[PDB]
Structures are given as structure tokens and as C-alpha cells.
Amino acid sequence: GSAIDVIVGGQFGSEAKGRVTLERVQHWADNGHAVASMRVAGPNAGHVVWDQGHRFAMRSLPVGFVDPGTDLYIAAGSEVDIEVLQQEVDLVESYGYEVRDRLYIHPQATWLEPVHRDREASSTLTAKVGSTSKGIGAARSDRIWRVANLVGDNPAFQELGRVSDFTEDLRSELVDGSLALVIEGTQGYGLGLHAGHYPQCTSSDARAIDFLAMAGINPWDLSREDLAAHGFRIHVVIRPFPIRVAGNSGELSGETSWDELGLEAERTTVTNKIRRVGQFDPELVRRAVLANGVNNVKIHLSMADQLIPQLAGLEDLPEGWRESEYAGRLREFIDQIPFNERLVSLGTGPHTRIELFKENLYFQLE
Amino acid sequence: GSAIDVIVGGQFGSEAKGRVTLERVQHWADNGHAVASMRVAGPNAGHVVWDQGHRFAMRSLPVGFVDPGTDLYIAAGSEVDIEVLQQEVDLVESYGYEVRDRLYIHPQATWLEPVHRDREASSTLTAKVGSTSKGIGAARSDRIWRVANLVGDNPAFQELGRVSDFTEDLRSELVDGSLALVIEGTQGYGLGLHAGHYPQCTSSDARAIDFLAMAGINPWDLSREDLAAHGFRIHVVIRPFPIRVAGNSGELSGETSWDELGLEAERTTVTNKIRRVGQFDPELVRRAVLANGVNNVKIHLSMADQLIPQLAGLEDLPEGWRESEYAGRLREFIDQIPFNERLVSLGTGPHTRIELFKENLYFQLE
Ligand SMILES: Nc1nc2c(ncn2[C@@H]2O[C@H](COP(=O)(O)OP(=O)(O)O)[C@@H](O)[C@H]2O)c(=O)[nH]1
Ligand SMILES: Nc1nc2c(ncn2[C@@H]2O[C@H](COP(=O)(O)OP(=O)(O)O)[C@@H](O)[C@H]2O)c(=O)[nH]1
Numbered sequence: 001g002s003a004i005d006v007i008v009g010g011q012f013g014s015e016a017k018g019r020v021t022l023e024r025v026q027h028w029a030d031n032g033h034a035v036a037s038m039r040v041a042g043p044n045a046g047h048v049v050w051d052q053g054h055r056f057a058m059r060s061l062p063v064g065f066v067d068p069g070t071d072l073y074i075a076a077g078s079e080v081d082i083e084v085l086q087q088e089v090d091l092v093e094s095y096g097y098e099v100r101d102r103l104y105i106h107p108q109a110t111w112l113e114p115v116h117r118d119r120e121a122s123s124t125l126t127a128k129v130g131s132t133s134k135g136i137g138a139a140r141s142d143r144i145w146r147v148a149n150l151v152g153d154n155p156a157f158q159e160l161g162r163v164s165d166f167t168e169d170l171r172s173e174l175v176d177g178s179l180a181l182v183i184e185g186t187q188g189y190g191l192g193l194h195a196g197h198y199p200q201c202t203s204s205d206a207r208a209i210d211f212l213a214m215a216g217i218n219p220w221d222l223s224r225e226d227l228a229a230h231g232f233r234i235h236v237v238i239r240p241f242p243i244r245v246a247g248n249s250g251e252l253s254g255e256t257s258w259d260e261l262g263l264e265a266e267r268t269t270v271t272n273k274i275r276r277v278g279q280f281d282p283e284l285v286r287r288a289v290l291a292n293g294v295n296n297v298k299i300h301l302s303m304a305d306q307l308i309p310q311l312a313g314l315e316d317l318p319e320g321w322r323e324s325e326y327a328g329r330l331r332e333f334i335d336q337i338p339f340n341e342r343l344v345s346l347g348t349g350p351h352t353r354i355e356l357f358k359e360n361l362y363f364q365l366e
Numbered sequence: 367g368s369a370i371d372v373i374v375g376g377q378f379g380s381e382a383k384g385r386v387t388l389e390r391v392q393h394w395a396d397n398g399h400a401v402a403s404m405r406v407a408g409p410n411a412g413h414v415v416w417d418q419g420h421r422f423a424m425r426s427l428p429v430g431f432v433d434p435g436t437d438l439y440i441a442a443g444s445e446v447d448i449e450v451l452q453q454e455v456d457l458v459e460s461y462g463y464e465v466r467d468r469l470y471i472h473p474q475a476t477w478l479e480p481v482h483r484d485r486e487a488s489s490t491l492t493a494k495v496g497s498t499s500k501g502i503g504a505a506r507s508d509r510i511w512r513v514a515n516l517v518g519d520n521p522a523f524q525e526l527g528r529v530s531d532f533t534e535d536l537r538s539e540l541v542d543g544s545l546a547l548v549i550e551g552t553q554g555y556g557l558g559l560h561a562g563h564y565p566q567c568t569s570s571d572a573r574a575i576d577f578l579a580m581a582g583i584n585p586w587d588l589s590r591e592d593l594a595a596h597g598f599r600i601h602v603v604i605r606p607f608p609i610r611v612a613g614n615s616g617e618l619s620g621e622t623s624w625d626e627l628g629l630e631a632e633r634t635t636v637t638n639k640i641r642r643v644g645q646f647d648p649e650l651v652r653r654a655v656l657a658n659g660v661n662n663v664k665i666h667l668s669m670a671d672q673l674i675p676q677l678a679g680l681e682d683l684p685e686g687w688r689e690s691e692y693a694g695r696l697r698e699f700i701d702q703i704p705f706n707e708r709l710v711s712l713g714t715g716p717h718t719r720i721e722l723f724k725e726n727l728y729f730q731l732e
Contacts, residue, residue: 076560108560129512141507146495146565165562168656194442194474194582199512209584213575216560218659220585220598232586290534293584 001366002174002222003028003231004181006208009188010288012244012252014268014275015237016302016347018047018063021184023345023353024235025064028180031363035180036071036170037064040214041204042079042112042136045186046269050351054095057269061088062184065099072102075183076167077214078109079139080151081117082160089160103161107152112139129200130249132270137203167216174221185211189288196287200250208234208292219296229366234292237300240280240307240333246273254279263306286338294339302347304354307333313349368539368588369394369546369597372574375554376654378610378618380634380641381603382668382713384413384429387550389711389719390601391430394546397729401546402437402536403430406580407570408445408478408502411552412635416717420461423635427454428550431465438468441549442533443580444475445505446517447483448526455526469527473518478505495566496615498636503569533582540587551577555654562653566616574600574658585662595732600658603666606646606673606699612639620645629672652704660705668713670720673699679715 005024009015021037028035043059050056051066060080064070074080085105092099116135125131142148157163173179185206189195192205204210212219219232241261244252245268255278258265266275289297305312308326321327334340346354371390375381387403394401409425416422417432426446430436440446451471458465482501489504491497508514523529539545551572555561558571570576578585585598607627610618611634621644624631632641655663671678674692687693700706712720 108562108564123511125512137510137512141510143559144503144507144510144569145489146491146503146567146569150564168653171656193509196474198474198516201512203510203512205579207579209575209579213571213573213579216657218575220659220661223661287534290537291582293586295589296586 001226001229001231002177002179002181003226003233004174004183004217004219004222005233005235006183006185006211007235007237008185008208008211008292009206010236010238010285010299011188011242012190013045013187014243015188015239017185017237018049018058019302019347019350020235020237020300021047021182022049022063022066024182025067025070027359028182029067029069031360033180034178035064035067035069035182036073037062037182037184038073038075038215039184040075040077040211041186042139043081043084044132044134044136044202044270047184047186048269048350055350056092058088059270060085061092061099061103064182065092065097068098070102072099072104073166073170074103074105074109075215076106076108077216078106079112079136080105080109080157081112081135082154082156085160100161104166105151105157105161105163106167107150107163107165109151110139110143111149111151111154112136113149116142126247128248130245130247132245132268134270140203171217171221174217175223181217183211183215189291190284195291197250200248232296233298234296235300236289236292236297237302238285238337239303240301241277241303242281242284243275243277245271246276249276252276252278253281253284280333280336282336282338289339294342297339297342298344299337299339299342300345300347301334301337301343304330304346305348311346311348311354313352315348315352315354317354367544367595367597368541368592369599370540370583370585370588371546371548371599371601372551372577373549373601373603374551374574374577374658375572376602376604376651376665377554377608378556379411379552379554380609381554381605383551383603384415384424385668385713385716386601386603386666387413387548388415388429388432390548391433391436393725394548395433395435397726399546400544401430401433401435401548402439403428403548403550404439404441404581405550406441406443406577407552408505409447409450410498410500410502410568410636413550413552414635414716421716422458424454425636426451427458427465430548431458431463434464436468438465438470439532439536440469440471440475441581442472442474443582444472445478445502446471446475446523447478447501448520448522451526466527470532471517471523471527471529472533473516473529473531475517476505476509477515477517477520478502479515482508492613494614496611496613498611498634500636506569537583537587540583541589547583549577549581555657556650561657563616566614598662599664600662601666602655602658602663603668604651604703605669606667607643607669608647608650610642611637612642615642618642618644619647646699648702648704655705660708663705663708664710665703665705665708666711666713667700667703667709670696670712671714677712677714677720679718680720681714681718682720
């Protein structure tokens, strides 16, 4: 059977899609199922995963690189900065990962060039909207004007992976075989161009359907049987203390400080700037779930350990839970998560979580 | 029961999505079912429908205006030129149609302003790629840079319809009980930004999933029962002599001339320039159907009367059909349509077609 997982952010980004994406890749991989890891969009966000004691903040290479048997795809609907990809390939190779012979880079992706970074960095974008100024918008604007170059136009990408129009081969594997495709989305619903905060937003929308359009794969490409087995899943990742990037980046409900929360300060991957942080806003998450398509949503509550420090690093509830004060605290927070009947996981650290369902059992049962 | 129809082009545009869209609106309306007519994207193409002896080439107003009971939506994922919309409202009102009290214009749509038209018209776009230079790309570029204004920023739009964030009201109507939503796509698969002809292409992709993303409605928002009733349909419209816009607009297989084909020359709605015309290319249509998602595709063969002049204006096959030489010509052409088991209709004129299935019977039954 085939499956499509799309991992998306329910707030303004940095909800831990990297962690959840890798968890999904390893779900299929550890069960011996063929699996592919695809990244879409552009390098204006890093997705953090841990493996064997190392922390990887990836902007371009799919986080499925951690699993040796996973094919890695950079979708047609991407912007690819070759200096970023070169650095990430060099980085993982220096830790013994092998990626070049299983990395597929679509030739129709936009080539994000130095001039795109320069154009954003010298513009009013950061001052006006808090942009990372990493060139993604400038590249997309050039693509719209049909003056951008494509990945297929730069032979240097062939040193890093296979530059090939793989989309129909991939669709065929889903239709005609048994492939699990994990699509790593970026940022979060509330940053979407049309989600309500414009102009304090990013240059695309950030729903599952946007990332599927970028991937060039349709959920209805799956067979009736595979859809009936719940083969199409949208993983909406949320955190209890929503963040935004530093600066003039838009409204943040209940904005507070890392110190007031008793939490270590967090910094953005692509700029190292301190994140803004606020209190949980269920209305944003409600709108995100509705926009993504509630019938296929599974909700992942990341950083439950920031709400309940006693959970840090655990993969099961601690012994004295029923008798503790913080059992009610967690239950009360869960009560006000919209659509909480779809909650499937509690994140407890950068590489740990409490799984609410017997995912491996249900795989074996199909 | 609810339903979503998305009407798309299988080639380079002007396949007759206007005609097919109106046919879909009237299918629901003539059966007394609640129906909504939505347009997405921008006014770089006209969709031609006929009603009561008049020809309407619509760039902005949904063609469902022809049916008095149909709500009309301009989606969030749109570019709206107010001069175009004003002229089209004025035009239909002069023929007795009433639209202003049933027209809903999303405030998050981009406001396409005169400066966007001027920027394209004075640029190299038309010379380089055959662009209509109607400002859609320049407006999308400003939206990407977060410098565009929105429909919600111009009170003048409120003179023409209701400016309201209707998306969740619309989604609720679909989820909770019998609405048919007809989404009028534009252009055609082969013009897509990532479909393979870049830079001789338009500034977006043109698949069903792109138009659904613009609409803000997901096919999987439909209930299990409604999907099981085939509630989600992608109508891929093709013509036997594919066209392109005039000029340096890209490769056109088997390019010929209107005189060589024995057909009246056709002109584009938005520029009045003469269309280029070629011979049917099955590979393009195969790629279009695959990209749209074959499992939900119904194929409409428009302009069958250009292939078989004896069909012009007919709603049924002519009397002597079995004995004619035309039967073989039509049969052979259908044989080489990709996925021709999904053929549902033969267009025979600007407002006539031969339906291959008993659509009204199916509606009453299922
Ligand atoms: N304390 C805690 N940290 C997490 C958890 N999950 C992920 N992290 C981390 O918190 C962060 C989220 O940032 P980021 O990875 O950029 O999110 P992404 O962009 O959505 O993938 C990273 O530093 C992660 O390593 C969790 O469950 N608990
Ligand atoms: N001869 C013939 N013309 C059709 C048919 N269907 C539509 N037309 C017309 O052919 C054309 C297609 O152009 P257009 O409406 O712009 O296509 P659209 O952009 O896809 O909606 C228009 O002039 C239509 O009125 C058909 O079945 N036979």
C-alpha cells in the first residue's frame, strides 16, 4: 500500500516539523516499508532534527537523509540555493551520511541565486515584515516574471544529486506500487500570503494543499483502498507557546518573554535572531486545521515539555502522573486545543515524543 | 449532498472552459440543487459563454452569472482589476442580469492596479513569451514582495459586490449539507509555470490542485458519502486543434494555419490577436490528465464540430451516422485521446454538446 504524509505548521512556524517529519520517515523505514522524503518551497526556514548526538538544522536537504534507505526529493515547486545545498551536503557527508546517490533535484525548481539574497537584504523587507531576507521572495518574483533561471539551467547541481524530472516516476510508484511519500512542509499556516496577516507574512501559503501542489503529487492519486486505509494524512504541528521571528513581524497574541515563561531563549535557524514568543491562541489553530482539511488532520502537540517540564525527554508518562498536579494542567491545555480528538502525539524534546496510538500495530494490521 | 467541480484546460488554454463551466452550473441549477460559481486567478484570459443570443467573454465575473439562483464568488487566490470587473458588471446589468447582491469578492485577493498593467505593457514580456501584458504577473510579483494592495484596501469594490471573507462560510456549506461548488479554472495545463515550457508559460500553474488552493477549499472537505457519490470531479477540457496566443509563445506541435484547416480564424479575448493553431498532441493531454489526478478526471472534448463539421450545433448524433465516413473519423480521433474511457461530452458549438451519460438520471438516482 502507498501513503502520503504532509507535515505542516499550525501557527507561525518553528512548531517542530523537522522532528515530526523524521518521526514519520522512521515510522515507515523501521517497518521496512519503502519511503521517500521530499522537501518543497525554499530555504527561508531550518528544520531541526537530531541523530547520533548531532543537531542538524536543515534548510534544503530533506531531513529523511537521517535514514539510509530513504530516497530524497527536492520538488519542482522549490527554490534551491546551491550554496546552501552544497553546505548541507558537505555537512552531512562529514558525519558519514551518504546522500548524493539517492538525492533527486527537480530541474523545474527555481535556482535561487546570490542576486536574490542581495536584493532582499538591501530592501525594506526585514524592517517592514521581519523577513529573513534569504532571497526566497525575490526568486519567486523573478520566476513569476519568467526571468529566473531554473535548476536545470545550472550544471553544478549535477555534482550534488541527480537532476531529473522525477515527478511522474514518483506518482507511478505511489499509484502502481507501495511507497510512503513524506512531504516536509515549511513555516506555518498563519504566515500564509492569504491567511490574514498580509503584509506581515511570507510569500506563499502554507497549507497542505499548497505543499502538495509544489510536490506535483495529488492526494487523490492514491487508490481507493489506500485512501480507505487512511493513507492520506496531514500532520499539523503546534506548540503551546507560539513564536514569531524577531522584529516587525506581525501580531502575536499574548506576547511575553522567554524569561517570563521560565524557558531558555530560542533563536531562528536562518538568521540566529531571538524569536518572539506568546501564549497559545486556539483560534489560529482552529483556522489552520479548517484550512488544511480537518478530515485528514492528525495533530502533534510539540514541546509539551515546555508546558510540563516533568515530561522532558520521556517517551511515556511518568510514574506518579495520576496523582500529580501537572496531570490536570496537561489535561486542561489539551481541552482547549481545537479538534483535540485528532491529537496523536506529545513532543517531549528535540527527538522524543509520547505516541498516543499503537502505530506499529496498526501498520501490521493494515 | 455536496459536490466540487473544477474545470481546467488540458492544453494551452481556450479549450472552452467557459462553455463547460456554465454547463456544470446549469446541471446543478436545472436540478434545483444549490450551486455556487467561483472564479480564481486573474483576468489574463476570457471565458466565452452565450445566453439568449448574446456572447459574453468574461475575464473576472464568474460565468455562473447566467443562472439567477447561483451565488458568485471571487476567490482569495485571485487578482482583481476593478476596471475590468466594473465593465463586466455594467455589461451584464445592461442585458438585465442581476449580480451585485449575489457577488462575493474576497478581501484577501490582490488588487490589480493600473500600474501593474503599465509595467507589463512596457516590459519585454510580450516579445519574449507572448504575454497578454494584462498585469497579472506584475500584480503577483508585488504580492510576493508584500507591496501589493488587497481588495480589502479599496472601498470601491464594495459598490460592485459584497467584500467579505466568505471562505469558511462556504466550506461550512459544503461540509454541512448540499452545496455544489463549481470552480472555474483558467488557461491550460501546458502553460503552467512548472509544466515544462518555462519561460514561455504563464505566472502560475494551471492544475485542479492549484485552483483549489486559490479557492481555499479542499476536495477532502467533502464527506465520505459525498466523495463516494463521486462528488469531486475535475473536468479536463481539450480541443482537437490546440491553440496558443500569437507571437513568441512557445512550441506548438504540428503548427498549421486556420486557412489550412478550413476554419475561421480565432482571436484571443483579452488581446484580439490571432491565435496560433496546431494538431492534436496526445502527449500533452496525457501529462495534463496525470498532473490533474486521473482518478477524478472527466474529459470534455470541445469543438468536435471543428473535427466533424456535420456535428455543428447538434445535441445528438445525426441520423445517418452509422453509415457515414465521419463516424470512423470521430472514432479514430477518440481512440488516440489519452484515458479516453473518461470521455463524457463532445462539444458541438459555443453553447451545445452531446452528453455521453444520463447526468440528470444519475442525479435523481444517486
Ligand atoms: N523542548 C522541546 N523542543 C523540541 C521539540 N520538538 C522540537 N524541538 C525543538 O524546538 C525547535 C523547533 O524549531 P524548528 O526545528 O526550526 O521547527 P520547524 O521549522 O518546524 O521544523 C528546534 O530547536 C527543535 O530541535 C519538543 O517536543 N520539545
Ligand atoms: N465551434 C465550437 N466552438 C466552441 C465550442 N465550445 C466553445 N466554443 C467556443 O470556442 C471558443 C474557446 O475560447 P474560450 O472561451 O476563451 O475558452 P476558455 O478560455 O477556455 O473558456 C469560444 O469562442 C467559444 O465561444 C464547441 O464545442 N464548438
